[PDB]
């Protein structure tokens, strides 16, 4: 039992295989399943777990009414065994709040939750199930973080947090933790103009965080982190293949160093990418307007080449079904010589796209890379909204 | 593993961070959640757990009708993983009865329940999950105890118990346990005139229990116990900031050595304080009349100065929401050179304040100290009573 | 871990303290609780568990209809953590069938279930969770066993089984198991004329089993087993305090060596006694006709003196409430120099006594000895049958 | 822990004893039980577990409507503690998909699930709870596998898989795994003309797989695997006692090297046999047309002798009750000098035979061999379909 070192390179990926699917909304039509959103997965030496923000109600409960609302005192980060649906009976409360991240350093799990009023939020940083550190809001406007896993190297786990406007310049910082205790704080530097909801992974001693610019860019920011020196750089994905939502049509040429703007009507969604030269994969919603569909695109040199475009594709969720947030995680403790990319998609059901119900929740699907050429089908949520009417 | 000793000082506390919230009434509107009251938390080397007295029914069950009643043969002390709500599926029965305390000595957990008729109640003392000792009523009138955790030092865990009237002089004893066996029994000594429902914590080799005088006093008794010498003293909180409910307006001067009378309509509520010179915090309901709201007041020298008043505050539960009991606990096994104060508030829903339902139950919120200046918002229960009509 | 040796005497018992209560019918009015009957408790080095025969349905399920029926292919011996109610989610299936026993030898648990048709039943004997031995019916008429725990000594665990009529002379055997394998089989010897449902405990190298004569006697048979020699004797309880149900009024003199007839209208009920000279306690129903109420009577020399009568009494279940089977168990792994007697009462609800519902089920209460003089109250089931109409 | 080696012979079997029964449909009438089909059991050093393919809904859920359908993105292989019913709360997700196998090699469990569209399905091979290998369809037509446990020897676990028509010649392969990695792939050889849903067990260094010829034969194919050389042969069960469903009347002689055709209206059902000279047992449905009843027949030399017929029988499920799939498993880690045959019967309820409900599910019964002559009765599902109307 030792601190995780990000020594290994990323595995070659040619297609994506199914890892897990919880069918939460289908099950929760009758069983006692908690209302969630903002899910993710995170692993540790023993296996992987699902994580999400509970709304502190079940899906069939009367309190599901009004769960489109983002921030309340009734939310918490919960975790559970991968593949089960989240019930009041099988879920571990990691921390209390309405924005989270979590990662395992090889010894113990760090979980962070922000809570409080918009003008005076605070994070509590847990390690090994105990609270270690608290961090007050520095800009007085919804202190918040990744909504997917963080990554650790030799016990140091960088976390990206933002405080400030969601629709204008904000105050992002990279906080470097060890055993839950702040080792260093950096202000965001570089050419990314706005940072939300980073999706982060490690390979060859480098952590890359692929984020949501909610202010300008339909191209995604990328923060590159050295967890040994505890330093970073930022810019945008170079590729012309735009991967936020909403977004305009892909232009001739992307831009490494500035946002590519446009699209309607929404300013962003959490997303991810794996960036490894020829071995690069970008996720995005199929729709360039709405959180519908989900596709993986193999885009060689997406990180460096403004003319890069897709050479493969795999549909994860068909464009007749609702998607949601997406994020990266890796089973860093697999018995492999390489770290194999994995990702999840949040399958949002209910408001605001399905207004015949009073609630908003999600289910989860997760996939990992394969070097083989595997066939694909759509892993949509599967619930019938009529049954909830 | 070793027996806990209380040699560490209390941590400096400048504000309170969220530790846990179970949202039990919201969840229990639809899921199978047990009806409880008299909750608390208690920790051990592995972590902290939630505790409460079940009523032996679920919240939506027909048998929730009538659960304002305090003492029945269907009640039990239950414990569960911190943050979950208490269901029939995730709860451990610690002991049977209708008044309890529990605490971990570093090796094993002691749990004590009282049961029986009013005139012939008895305690059963459990240690490591096995029954060790039984204690028959000495005064023939509802033998009872703290309703929050006890504290242990070098194997010795003092517990404060009362037997006798709730509205007149009663027979309080301090019973000193080791591995669930009585080491010594003391009658209450000193200037506290009536003792109920002590909230106790250790620091600096000293256990302080802040109690409820249900006879005359709107100021809270304080018992100070030396667990090495197995002796105690008692008096009242000196501060003019009165902390029982009901209470009169705060007077110009408190009284260290007599009850301050007044207040309407209720004789008392379980509460707590942390008393550490300048580093002193008093909890109380916001209402001076009713169990609504909850505030933390930093009252330097509350223990010693009749003129001591607040220098800061933090609303825990707004005064538009119901509160209930509150009590002290500490994670004495944290990785810290000091013991950090924690507390909970019982958020009572249903009767008698909400008589549109037939039941009485509660949810839990718990917070711990921070040296930082954290923002705050109200952590009220969050259930809509209309949904239960 | 080591094999249990019955090296200690019984503890002195002056009164009985509450050990556990599951409130299963109150909870199972709304939560998913299995229909059961024939419960017991059994301990091991880690603590004690509850056991019962499930009916393979929940209480509120439609399949609860008709659960007065004793023997179906849907029944199983389930065990669960002491104090919880038995749900589909917290119960361990020990074995399949409609009559059982179970005991822990200090290394692993042996469980035995009988199943099959009346004329062709069979036992399966499990050890450490694996099936070891099978035993075919020898008399072609409902091969069956204790319905409470067995007892082990130096790895030898005797079990009493009957096969044959319930209303005439039957073929009872004592089978001595070690690690689930048969060591020896004895035909019943001595003066007991009919044996059902033995309740057994150990002390001082002797196992005593207090049974139900369903044929003739209102006095209970007593089998005395030597688990080292693997031999036994039998007779009846001597006391004039008759403890089966139904029974006649207590005569002025018992009978050590023949059944005392009389009683209407029930031929018997499972019960128990602790027999230890002056330290002897007899349980029975308060009603002499019906499974109503439950009392403990201290009857010095009940085992040897036909004139022995009660010197003290404790009501366990008042005679306005339903009782049921009762049986013995001991926490042989307690940290005491003596083995402390415990018992349980099955609190039967529904048919036949409560015919306004379609089901028959039970809850459990359990108590253990105290040397103190504890007060008592009634530990009845607590469910309101009207809520199930 | 060490790799399992198939060193032991089969145990003599003269009758079958009950091992487990989950009563899932009875319980699931009211409790939250997943819809399933294609169940099995599989053991490991600690005991045995139940397995099945969930439909990603509860039985009383609205999503149970349409669960006759075989292949959806909402299915998964789930496992749970033997004898419990499968709920969302007690089931482990082994892998995602709509065809499976699993087996333990003595060190860890391998589980394999196929998912995807009919023309582009893929297997994912898990070991120790982590994905190891992926296998794309080779024939573009529902890559699929055993639907009961595989068997391992010295770390090598062969698995039979088919891809191609269900009603014509298909491409079957035997894939030999070690630690979830492919050691060798063989095309099916020998005289079996069509292979589906193999039921496999090991004894004396040989693995025997008794399968389903869904194209022609009402006699069952038998694949014999040498797990050290990683080679096999195939033919049919010799015996005139035909054991697929549907089937014609048993002919005067069977045929070891070609299918015996006929029967109406269905082309096959998954089944099993244990083949060990005299000590040979064949399962089959009692009906020759429908999945009704289930019987075990002792058919000496069924593997070699075309004139072999039954010398004994045991009814497992009477012919007034629905059966379903059946399969082999063995507790290879029992404390016996032989490996004792076990099997399960899938008890299918709902569509198509019970059209008054919208769903299809099942419960499980499992039995193992006994050398004794045990009595038997019918272990039918036991649910009342009227309660679901
Ligand atoms: C970001 O978050 C942080 C932390 O969550 C937060 O920090 C707080 O900042 C405020 C100032 O903005 C601090 O407030 C101070 O509180 C001091 C003590 O207040 C309590 O006690 C008062 C005295 O009570 C006694 O006597 C009265 C009158 O006779 C009697 O009613 C009482 O029963 C008792 O006997 C009391 O009046 C006061 O009441 C307020 O709060 C209660 C709930 O507790 C509420 O019910 C009341 O309605 C009322 O709101 C309170 O209970 C106080 O002495 C201090 O006042 C001095 O300084 C101010 C300048 O700020 C002067 O105006 C004043 O003259 C005083 O000399 C001041 O009010 C608070 O302590 C901080 N808390 C912490 C934990 O740091 C920030 O506000 C947040 N930022 C944003 C933008 O939200
Ligand atoms: C605090 O709680 C404790 C714990 O429960 C409690 O302590 C008990 O105190 C009472 C006295 O208050 C003690 O009662 C004694 O019991 C003796 C034995 O009684 C049993 O047997 C009697 C005879 O039974 C046989 O004979 C009759 C024919 O005579 C026949 O019907 C029977 O079938 C049988 O053959 C029997 O009469 C008696 O019945 C009582 O109790 C049963 C429940 O078991 C109930 O259903 C009946 O309605 C009835 O109440 C019982 O079954 C008894 O010998 C003894 O009598 C002497 O003492 C009293 C004074 O106490 C004298 O008045 C009398 O003349 C005798 O000299 C007495 O009844 C009991 O043993 C204590 N138990 C323990 C565990 O200590 C405290 O009272 C509680 N305090 C408060 C304030 O509530
Ligand atoms: C077994 O399943 C396999 C796994 O899914 C499958 O293998 C797949 O085979 C298909 C057909 O051969 C291959 O498709 C090839 O894909 C590349 C990549 O195409 C993607 O990118 C292009 C270009 O996008 C950009 O420019 C367009 C054009 O101007 C803009 O609109 C856009 O915004 C971008 O700037 C895009 O046009 C493609 O569009 C397809 O896919 C999406 C979903 O991702 C649909 O929404 C869309 O309508 C259309 O169907 C696509 O996004 C392409 O260049 C080649 O020409 C070819 O199309 C897959 O790559 C291959 N996948 C893998 C993982 O191997 C097998 O086909 C399947 N077998 C069977 C029998 O079903
Ligand atoms: C305690 O329970 C014991 C456990 O069950 C039980 O012991 C059983 O005792 C019975 C009665 O002695 C024995 O029966 C014997 O069985 C053999 C084999 O019978 C099976 O095979 C024959 C031949 O089948 C083939 O040919 C026929 C006709 O041409 C075809 O129809 C069939 O397809 C085959 O091609 C078959 O006729 C038998 O049919 C019976 O059983 C089936 C269920 O399997 C029913 O559907 C059917 O109606 C009929 O009842 C059977 O399948 C036979 O050859 C002997 O002559 C004799 O019948 C059991 O073998 C024996 N079992 C064991 C495991 O020991 C005890 O009886 C019981 N005690 C009490 C008191 O109940
Ligand atoms: C869902 O929640 C909304 C918001 O609380 C409920 O709408 C309120 O209903 C109350 C009681 O009738 C009104 O007095 C409020 O003014 C309404 N508020 C708003 C914002 O509309 C609605 O009733 C709930 N629906 C259900 C079915 O519970
Ligand atoms: C809640 O509990 C009360 C008390 O048992 C019930 O009130 C009784 O109702 C019974 C049955 O109709 C009447 O005979 C009595 O008049 C009532 N007793 C008292 C003290 O009021 C009430 O019915 C229960 N309510 C529900 C909905 O279960
Ligand atoms: C069960 O599932 C079927 C299939 O989805 C449902 O049938 C549909 O019902 C809707 C609403 O009545 C109709 O618009 C469609 O025409 C039907 N579709 C088909 C394919 O038949 C059926 O309603 C469901 N039944 C229940 C009780 O949920
Ligand atoms: C507050 C800004 C932030 C990022 C743009 O909004 C997020 C957008 C969300 C969204 O676009 O769906 C939902 C998130 N729950 C919300 N985060 C919080 C903490 O409320
Ligand atoms: C019996 C006196 C005691 C302290 C005043 O009453 C308490 C008051 C209560 C209260 O004020 O809410 C509830 C407690 N459940 C009750 N305790 C018992 C054991 O019934
Ligand atoms: C079959 C005789 C036996 C003992 C008299 O009957 C018992 C009586 C019972 C009873 O008196 O309540 C219930 C038991 N479940 C039953 N046992 C079985 C195996 O059916
Ligand atoms: C696809 C052919 C295959 C074997 C003949 O059909 C099976 C028949 C079934 C059956 O006969 O009941 C149900 C199985 N779930 C199905 N398998 C799959 C993967 O769909
Ligand atoms: C108290 O516990 C601490 C930490 O285990 C230990 O170092 C110290 O010696 C203890 N003091 C006493 C007097 O037991
Ligand atoms: Ca954007
Ligand atoms: Ca008071
Ligand atoms: Ca009798
Ligand atoms: Ca066939």
Coordinates of N, CA, C and O in Angstrom, one line a residue, chain C residues 185-236:
Chain C
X185 N -25.5 -41.7 17.0 CA -27.0 -41.6 17.0 C -27.5 -42.4 18.1 O -27.2 -43.7 18.1
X186 N -28.3 -41.8 19.0 CA -29.0 -42.6 20.1 C -30.5 -42.5 19.9 O -31.1 -41.4 19.7
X187 N -31.2 -43.6 20.1 CA -32.7 -43.5 20.3 C -32.9 -42.9 21.7 O -32.2 -43.2 22.7
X188 N -34.0 -42.1 21.8 CA -34.4 -41.6 23.1 C -34.6 -42.8 24.1 O -35.2 -43.8 23.8
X189 N -34.1 -42.6 25.3 CA -34.2 -43.5 26.4 C -34.9 -42.7 27.6 O -35.1 -41.5 27.5
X190 N -35.2 -43.5 28.6 CA -35.7 -42.9 29.8 C -37.2 -42.7 29.9 O -38.0 -43.3 29.1
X191 N -37.7 -41.8 30.8 CA -39.1 -41.8 31.1 C -39.9 -40.7 30.4 O -41.2 -40.6 30.6
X192 N -39.3 -39.8 29.6 CA -40.1 -38.9 28.8 C -40.9 -39.7 27.8 O -40.2 -40.6 27.1
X193 N -42.1 -39.5 27.6 CA -43.0 -40.3 26.7 C -43.2 -39.7 25.3 O -43.5 -40.4 24.4
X194 N -42.8 -38.4 25.1 CA -43.0 -37.7 23.8 C -42.1 -36.5 23.9 O -42.2 -35.8 24.9
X195 N -41.4 -36.2 22.8 CA -40.5 -35.2 22.8 C -40.7 -34.3 21.5 O -40.6 -34.9 20.4
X196 N -40.8 -33.0 21.7 CA -40.9 -32.1 20.6 C -40.0 -30.8 21.0 O -40.0 -30.5 22.2
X197 N -39.4 -30.2 20.0 CA -39.0 -28.8 20.1 C -38.2 -28.5 21.4 O -38.5 -27.6 22.1
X198 N -37.1 -29.2 21.6 CA -36.3 -29.1 22.8 C -35.6 -27.7 22.8 O -35.0 -27.2 21.8
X199 N -35.5 -27.1 24.0 CA -34.8 -25.9 24.3 C -33.6 -26.2 25.2 O -33.8 -26.8 26.3
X200 N -32.4 -26.1 24.8 CA -31.2 -26.7 25.4 C -30.2 -25.6 25.8 O -30.1 -24.6 25.2
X201 N -29.5 -25.9 26.9 CA -28.4 -25.1 27.3 C -27.4 -26.0 28.0 O -27.7 -27.1 28.5
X202 N -26.2 -25.4 28.2 CA -25.1 -26.1 28.8 C -24.6 -25.4 30.0 O -24.6 -24.2 30.1
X203 N -24.0 -26.2 31.0 CA -23.3 -25.7 32.1 C -22.6 -26.8 32.8 O -23.2 -27.9 32.9
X204 N -21.4 -26.6 33.3 CA -20.7 -27.6 34.0 C -20.6 -29.0 33.3 O -20.6 -30.0 34.0
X205 N -20.4 -28.9 32.0 CA -20.2 -30.2 31.2 C -21.5 -30.9 30.9 O -21.5 -32.1 30.5
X206 N -22.7 -30.4 31.3 CA -24.0 -31.0 31.1 C -24.9 -30.2 30.2 O -25.0 -29.0 30.4
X207 N -25.6 -30.8 29.2 CA -26.5 -30.1 28.5 C -27.9 -30.6 28.9 O -28.2 -31.8 29.0
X208 N -28.8 -29.6 29.2 CA -30.2 -29.9 29.6 C -31.1 -29.4 28.5 O -30.9 -28.2 28.1
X209 N -32.0 -30.2 28.1 CA -33.0 -29.9 27.1 C -34.4 -30.0 27.7 O -34.7 -31.1 28.2
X210 N -35.1 -28.9 27.7 CA -36.5 -28.8 28.3 C -37.4 -28.8 27.1 O -37.2 -27.9 26.2
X211 N -38.3 -29.7 26.9 CA -39.0 -30.0 25.7 C -40.5 -29.9 25.9 O -41.0 -29.4 26.9
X212 N -41.2 -30.2 24.8 CA -42.7 -30.2 24.7 C -43.2 -31.6 24.5 O -42.8 -32.2 23.5
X213 N -44.0 -32.1 25.5 CA -44.7 -33.4 25.3 C -46.0 -33.0 24.6 O -46.8 -32.4 25.3
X214 N -46.2 -33.3 23.3 CA -47.4 -32.9 22.6 C -48.5 -33.9 22.7 O -49.5 -33.7 22.1
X215 N -48.1 -35.1 23.3 CA -49.0 -36.2 23.3 C -49.9 -36.1 24.6 O -51.1 -36.1 24.5
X216 N -49.2 -36.2 25.8 CA -50.0 -36.4 27.1 C -49.7 -35.3 28.0 O -50.6 -34.8 28.7
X217 N -48.5 -34.9 28.2 CA -48.1 -34.2 29.4 C -48.2 -32.6 29.3 O -47.8 -32.0 28.3
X218 N -48.7 -32.0 30.4 CA -48.6 -30.6 30.6 C -47.4 -30.2 31.4 O -47.0 -29.0 31.5
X219 N -46.8 -31.2 32.0 CA -45.4 -31.0 32.5 C -44.4 -31.2 31.4 O -44.7 -32.0 30.5
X220 N -43.3 -30.6 31.4 CA -42.3 -30.7 30.3 C -41.3 -31.8 30.5 O -40.7 -31.9 31.6
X221 N -41.0 -32.5 29.5 CA -39.9 -33.5 29.5 C -38.5 -32.7 29.6 O -38.4 -31.6 29.2
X222 N -37.6 -33.4 30.3 CA -36.3 -32.9 30.4 C -35.3 -34.0 30.0 O -35.4 -35.2 30.5
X223 N -34.5 -33.7 29.0 CA -33.4 -34.7 28.6 C -32.1 -34.1 29.1 O -31.8 -32.9 28.9
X224 N -31.3 -35.0 29.7 CA -30.0 -34.6 30.3 C -28.9 -35.3 29.4 O -28.9 -36.5 29.4
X225 N -28.1 -34.5 28.7 CA -27.1 -35.1 27.8 C -25.7 -34.9 28.3 O -25.3 -33.8 28.7
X226 N -24.9 -35.9 28.2 CA -23.5 -35.9 28.5 C -22.8 -35.8 27.1 O -22.8 -36.9 26.4
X227 N -22.3 -34.7 26.7 CA -21.7 -34.6 25.3 C -20.4 -35.2 25.2 O -19.9 -35.3 24.1
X228 N -19.7 -35.6 26.3 CA -18.4 -36.3 26.2 C -18.7 -37.8 26.0 O -18.1 -38.3 25.1
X229 N -19.5 -38.4 26.8 CA -19.8 -39.8 26.7 C -20.8 -40.1 25.6 O -21.0 -41.2 25.1
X230 N -21.5 -39.0 25.2 CA -22.5 -39.0 24.1 C -23.6 -40.0 24.6 O -24.0 -40.9 23.9
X231 N -24.1 -39.7 25.8 CA -25.2 -40.5 26.4 C -26.2 -39.5 27.0 O -25.9 -38.4 27.2
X232 N -27.4 -40.0 27.3 CA -28.4 -39.2 27.9 C -29.4 -39.9 28.8 O -29.4 -41.2 28.7
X233 N -30.1 -39.2 29.6 CA -31.3 -39.7 30.3 C -32.4 -38.8 30.1 O -32.3 -37.7 29.5
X234 N -33.7 -39.2 30.4 CA -34.8 -38.4 30.2 C -35.8 -38.7 31.4 O -36.0 -39.8 31.9
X235 N -36.6 -37.7 31.7 CA -37.7 -37.7 32.6 C -38.6 -36.5 32.4 O -38.5 -35.9 31.3
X236 N -39.4 -36.1 33.4 CA -40.2 -34.8 33.3 C -39.7 -33.9 34.4 O -39.1 -34.4 35.4

